[PDB]
Amino acid sequence: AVNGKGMNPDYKAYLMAPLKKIPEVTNWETFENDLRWAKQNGFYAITVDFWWGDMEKNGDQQFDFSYAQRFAQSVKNAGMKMIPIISTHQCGGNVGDDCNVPIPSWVWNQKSDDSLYFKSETGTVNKETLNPLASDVIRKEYGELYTAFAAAMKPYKDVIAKIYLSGGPAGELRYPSYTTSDGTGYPSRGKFQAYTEFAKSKFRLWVLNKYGSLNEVNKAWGTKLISELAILPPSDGEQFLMNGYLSMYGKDYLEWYQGILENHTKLIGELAHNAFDTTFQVPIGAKIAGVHWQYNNPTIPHGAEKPAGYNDYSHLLDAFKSAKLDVTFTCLEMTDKGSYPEYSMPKTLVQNIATLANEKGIVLNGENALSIGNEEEYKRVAEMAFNYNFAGFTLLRYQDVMYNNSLMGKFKDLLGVTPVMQTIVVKNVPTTIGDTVYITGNRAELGSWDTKQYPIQLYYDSHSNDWRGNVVLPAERNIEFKAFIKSKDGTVKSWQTIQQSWNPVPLKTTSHTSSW
Numbered sequence: 367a368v369n370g371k372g373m374n375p376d377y378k379a380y381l382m383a384p385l386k387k388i389p390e391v392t393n394w395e396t397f398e399n400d401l402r403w404a405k406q407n408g409f410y411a412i413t414v415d416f417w418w419g420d421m422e423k424n425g426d427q428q429f430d431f432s433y434a435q436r437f438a439q440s441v442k443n444a445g446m447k448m449i450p451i452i453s454t455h456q457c458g459g460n461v462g463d464d465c466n467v468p469i470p471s472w473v474w475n476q477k478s479d480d481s482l483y484f485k486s487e488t489g490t491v492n493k494e495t496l497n498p499l500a501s502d503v504i505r506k507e508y509g510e511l512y513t514a515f516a517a518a519m520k521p522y523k524d525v526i527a528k529i530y531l532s533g534g535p536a537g538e539l540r541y542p543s544y545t546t547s548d549g550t551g552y553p554s555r556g557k558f559q560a561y562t563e564f565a566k567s568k569f570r571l572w573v574l575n576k577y578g579s580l581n582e583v584n585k586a587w588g589t590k591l592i593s594e595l596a597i598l599p600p601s602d603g604e605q606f607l608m609n610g611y612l613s614m615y616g617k618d619y620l621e622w623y624q625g626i627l628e629n630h631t632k633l634i635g636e637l638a639h640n641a642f643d644t645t646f647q648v649p650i651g652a653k654i655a656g657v658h659w660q661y662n663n664p665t666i667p668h669g670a671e672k673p674a675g676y677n678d679y680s681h682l683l684d685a686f687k688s689a690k691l692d693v694t695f696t697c698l699e700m701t702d703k704g705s706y707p708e709y710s711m712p713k714t715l716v717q718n719i720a721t722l723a724n725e726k727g728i729v730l731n732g733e734n735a736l737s738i739g740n741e742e743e744y745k746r747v748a749e750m751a752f753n754y755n756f757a758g759f760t761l762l763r764y765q766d767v768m769y770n771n772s773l774m775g776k777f778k779d780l781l782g783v784t785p786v787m788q789t790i791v792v793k794n795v796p797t798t799i800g801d802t803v804y805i806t807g808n809r810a811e812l813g814s815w816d817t818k819q820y821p822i823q824l825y826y827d828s829h830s831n832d833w834r835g836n837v838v839l840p841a842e843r844n845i846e847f848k849a850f851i852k853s854k855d856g857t858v859k860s861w862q863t864i865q866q867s868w869n870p871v872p873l874k875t876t877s878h879t880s881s882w
């Protein structure tokens with residue numbers, strides 16, 4: 367893996383449950399049989415959406431966690447673990463949504479103004495989830511729902527491996543910038559969602575707070591606004607994405623726009639930790655969506671990411687670190703294209719986030735964007751997950767592998783692996799001052815024969831006078847590897863004469879010793 371290290375020793379695989387309730391797509395007895403089968407194929411836990419529209423449907427504080435408890439019982443029965451998703455977003459309307467579960471309708475009656483929902487540049491109204499701007503409503507409702515959920519799941523703390531929060535649309539921390547209704551679906555540029563009167567007032571007050579008065583605002587922006595009511599969001603999104611974003615106004619608006627998401631992260635994170643920490647003591651995470659289209663467009667740079675609220679990823683990840691939330695990213699299965707008309711750079715994005723996350727010491731997890739029906743895609747996920755230090759990978763979705771032993775088998779082989787610590791030893795390596803030794807092998811875990819950025823470095827044992835390293839390998843998998851010397855200048859000097867193998871890698875720690 368990058369920086370000469372191996373796969374993450376804490377790696378685990380998870381499986382996404384159906385979008386609809388179990389008894390609607392199968393039955394409990396069979397669900398349990400499926401879970402034992404999934405477990406058999408390397409899956410550690412099942413992630414499941416617990417819809418807000420289901421849990422607090424009829425009215426404020428009129429909870430119904432019965433389904434969630436019943437689900438948890440079958441998980442305990444099947445001898446598995448779960449990762450619930452407190453889905454404070456609507457099911458239905460997103461790519462691949464076979465369901466229809468809106469958030470509670472009484473919630474909208476809580477406000478007189480338009481603070482709760484979103485409105486695009488063209489006036490399209492979105493109500494899939496609550497507008498992060500309405501922090502007061504969010505603090506009350508989420509605080510209440512998280513606390514109530516914790517109490518109801520307390521009896522099953524033993525089968526809960528982690529908890530995911532919903533930061534917005536489709537359970538991801540973003541703005542609903544890409545929707546068919548708004549004419550902003552893939553691969554089109556996105557639209558800014560700050561056009562409610564509430565959003566306008568907030569930006570305006572945020573600006574005047576930063577500068578004090580309009581006279582200072584104009585000085586900073588080099589503008590000539592006559593009144594304060596002239597402080598508004600981008601009148602032309604495309605034009606803003608073309609050049610507006612470069613001005614002081616542009617820099618400021620984008621700061622506020624993304625900032626709303628950073629604050630939201632800090633808020634739901636504090637509510638979640640207060641609610642779940644003492645009773646469960648498990649990791650809490652949130653997701654960032656993979657908006658890969660319009661990434662390398664020359665005219666509108668990142669024309670899909672910006673409207674979604676992703677302007678500065680590094681600053682955005684700092685918010686997760688502060689909120690003490692683990693982060694999940696998508697699109698691990700795809701590769702870069704970066705060509706007209708889409709300008710899709712999936713693989714580059716992932717690598718960027720992964721770098722930042724690992725730099726910041728943030729636990730990283732990944733998921734696939736679309737249903738995988740080919741092992742070639744599994745191989746792509748493998749390269750990313752085992753080289754970019756992902757702590758876990760979640761497969762979307764249940765029915766894909768559950769009713770196809772072929773995919774299920776390829777998944778077990780490639781991604782449903784168990785990391786084990788093993789000692790690699792190489793004897794009599796002709797090293798000179800400046801020579802560093804590495805190993806590379808056939809599997810994604812060993813860098814897939816790459817010697818440039820994925821090899822695993824070995825270290826010299828002064829006492830044993832040889833080169834060795836504690837490498838994390840996939841337990842019970844056949845591997846082929848070879849050690850090589852890399853010179854001071856960074857180029858391969860020579861290779862180990864004979865190709866080594868471990869068929870298979872032991873389930874218990876030990877060592878593999880070979881000579882140059």
Ligand SMILES: OC[C@H]1O[C@H](OCC[C@H]2CO2)[C@H](O)[C@@H](O)[C@@H]1O
Pocket residue numbers: 382383385415451453456457458460461462463536537538653655696735762
């Ligand atoms: O089942 C998990 C999630 O799966 C989908 O998201 C697409 C994949 C990413 C954007 O989680 C659904 O649209 C979400 O509502 C759901 O929370």
Ligand SMILES: [Ca+2]
Pocket residue numbers: 422426427506507510511
């Ligand atoms: Ca409530």
